[PDB]
Design a protein around this ligand. Structure first.
Ligand code: CU
Ligand code: CU
Ligand code: CU
Ligand code: CU
Ligand code: CU
Ligand code: CU
Ligand code: ZN
Ligand code: ZN
Ligand code: ZN
Lengths: 334, 334, 334
């Protein structure tokens, strides 16, 4: 029975970090308790000062990543404070029944609820807010994240050999649909409700105005680049709740990749570009071998460089001339 | 020789049903005979009354699904009645040679033809009408369906263990390109020929006006939802002859999925979202475990909720609190 | 050490051909030397006379395909003649470090450089020109190609049995973004620099004006169709450096396909349509069984027939009535 089974409480951390946790483990199943608080807020999303009337789980885009093990039970308390204006709920793609939990978590401002479901399938799974009649608006406005359910004995390769990561990072990619006025400038709205009609009309064209990692253009560059060092293995979790994307690590590879995101399937090796289907999360492992700066981006280069879907990873260590060597620097042509 | 081999005659049924048939079987190869009649017709495709100058195999979008077994021969009589205005033909992606049969089935109104080909490869395969110089118009106007070629010993999992379905359903997804007039309202045309030029211009923008399952917005909801019960396995066949889509069962999963649609390959398990490439059909199995209402949709949520790509499945039975439990209903925040 | 190891010099040939080479081989690793010269040029890209201010590796779109074996070292001399106006560089997705080599190959007009990297992973990999601040423009203007790294013992099927091709062909697919003037006609530019601003604005809409194989509408049809004969196996290499595409051989199949393009993974069999992610190259094998004309195209049929993404293959030999037979030619309906 899930009733008896020890309970545990997890504290969440802001993306792109993922909360400390175990890969392989000797512990038996548990009821893992989490809490999240919805926050509607206006956010600045680019270098020219454009804003989005946004909606978030826990104040961030994307929401925090939740980690449990196969066979555990997830038990979430979802809170919607009186300071918000809309109702919300939650749908876990990793769960079975009731539209992922949406039908049992409908919360008006000033209310809360508690849902439990069994995490009986391994992989990275999207969760979203899906209120009847406003599903796409809430999702494109920022209300998505990932639940990672790891196998009890850790990750495995196609032959059943063990795989591991030394660090984990989580990246949410958001296609945004910001309206413009007759002067061709983007519109700035006083409340969340007033942005609605105009936004639906942009959505229907299927052309995003911006496509961003973790809330804004440049969120993962400069002081905020991801970091690693030569010899370390990183797990890159990538979610896209509404639209397809194609991650690529410029200067590196996907060593082992589950593009559909489900760990009971064998991963593919040596990828240059992988593919995340809209409405899913995927995962890639890579072991660094050269120091320097890498670009982790959506490899439709217009979507990356013009629209915003690109970040940086800064890697420390020693250069490997066997792997790569500048034989003759740029010089005049004889 | 295919000449000698018993012949059999199959009677087709309207989507979303699939005609009775056997999975595993002791019968040897046969020549399976089918007939289809082309029907051009104006159809209502949404809740505001918009119409499409449509073209169909057998009066439906999509055409009926044809089922045979690996090693059988398909023998189709294609009829184009004098009441139609355009010529047509057929291209089976499951066949080898002559552009899938198009070059041997060109039929003007008042004519018919008969084609035979060997179904030597297992999977779900699209068929379409492809007349020289008008290929995309006929396809986007409704002329596509699926041929399912099952392995003689039935479906198998990656380890070679047997899989089965208790029911089958077939869903065709159609990206439509309906023109608008200077007043911004959709155009209504007196004949099929007059819709042509305007439609080509919308097509070239790559933005559909509507995206629908089985002919229209809401075709698979309300009195027309699909049905199942807890403990039953369903096979969901999904075709898209022109554009990519990403099926997802909200509240459930793809237990075993062949996203490229070819049964000699091992399927993937536990998927949240799968991917059907434009110009192919794919297949997913799922065993229900909770009763209620599920949404089966394209998980670009704008394409699903705003443009039309979504249906419903109504499932009867007993609720499972181990799988999912509402711990604390929505209530005021302490 | 890579220093000692015999060197060899390869001479490149224009697409769609691939330079003679060995599949399985008894030779040990080598340092394989290549040279490429960048050429900016105005090109005619359609049947109405539209031009593109283009940028190429070696005068062609796509660039030539380079072939080495796993464990070899690639050593490229990249030359940028004084007659060009822009700087350029190179990023090999098959390489490790320094943004694929871009950071060590920045060459202004009148300069050259030489890069070496170890090809330690099997598959077809895209290479591109990626200058800081102008990455998407150079790529969409024509600066991409494929490096094929074959396994030392040749290609293998999922069970480890040997596979081979008798011929190879290489196809690059280019999404183009040509601006229009107030009269709705496409613009013709005097220099490469003057096309820039207008092109960026079209790019940002994500709607290509044209989508072409190997530089232009019809590049692979008529006198320029690909060729084969019944009983022969062909390898079709397909690259798309910026946008997703879905190859399909009308009248045939993908017998064995590596859609992500990495040969250490098992291929899928019997495909009708496969999928090349933007920023990657993929590969398919097919053995012809019927003579005639086939269409090799992108199976979004609008992108193929209206925008340009389609070619032809002309196959000689004897017709097979077991595989396909016209039973009753088109005739009046009784
Ligand atoms: Cu919400
Ligand atoms: Cu969902
Ligand atoms: Cu037709
Ligand atoms: Cu086709
Ligand atoms: Cu360049
Ligand atoms: Cu790249
Ligand atoms: Zn490690
Ligand atoms: Zn059953
Ligand atoms: Zn051969």
């Amino acid at each position: 029975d899930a009733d008896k089974l020890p309970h545990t409480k997890v504290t969440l951390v802001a993306p792109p970090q993922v909360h400390p946790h175990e890969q392989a483990t000797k512990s038996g199943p548990k009821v893992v308790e989490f809490t999240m608080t919805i926050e509607e807020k206006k956010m600045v999303i680019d270098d020219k000062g454009t804003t989005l009337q946004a909606m978030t789980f826990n104040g961030s885009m994307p929401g925090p990543t939740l980690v449990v093990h196969e066979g555990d039970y997830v038990q979430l308390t979802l809170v919607n404070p009186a300071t918000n204006a809309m109702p919300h709920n939650v749908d876990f793609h990793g769960a079975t029944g009731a539209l992922g939990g949406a039908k049992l978590t409908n919360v008006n401002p000033g209310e809360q609820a508690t849902l439990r479901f069994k995490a009986d399938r391994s992989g990275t799974f999207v969760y979203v807010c899906a209120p009847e009649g406003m599903v796409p608006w809430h999702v494109v406005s920022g209300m998505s994240g990932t639940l990672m359910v790891l196998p009890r004995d850790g990750l495995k390769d196609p032959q059943g050999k063990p795989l591991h990561y030394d660090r984990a990072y989580t990246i949410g990619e958001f296609d945004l649909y910001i309206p413009k006025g007759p002067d061709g400038k983007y519109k700035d709205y006083a409340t969340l409700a007033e942005s609605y009609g105009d936004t639906v009309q942009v959505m229907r064209t299927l052309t995003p105005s911006h496509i961003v990692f973790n809330g804004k253009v440049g969120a993962l560059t400069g002081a905020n680049a991801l970091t690693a060092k030569v010899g370390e293995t990183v797990l890159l979790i990538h979610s896209q709740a509404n639209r397809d994307t194609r991650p690529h690590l410029i200067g590196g590879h996907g060593d082992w990749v589950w593009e559909t995101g489900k760990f009971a399937n064998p991963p593919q090796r040596d990828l240059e570009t992988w593919f995340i289907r809209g409405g899913s999360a995927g995962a890639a492992l890579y072991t660094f071998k050269q120091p320097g700066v890498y670009a982790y981006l959506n490899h439709n280069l217009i979507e990356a460089f013009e629209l915003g879907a690109a970040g940086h990873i800064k890697v420390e260590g020693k250069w490997n001339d066997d792997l790569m060597k500048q034989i003759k620097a740029p010089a005049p042509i004889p």
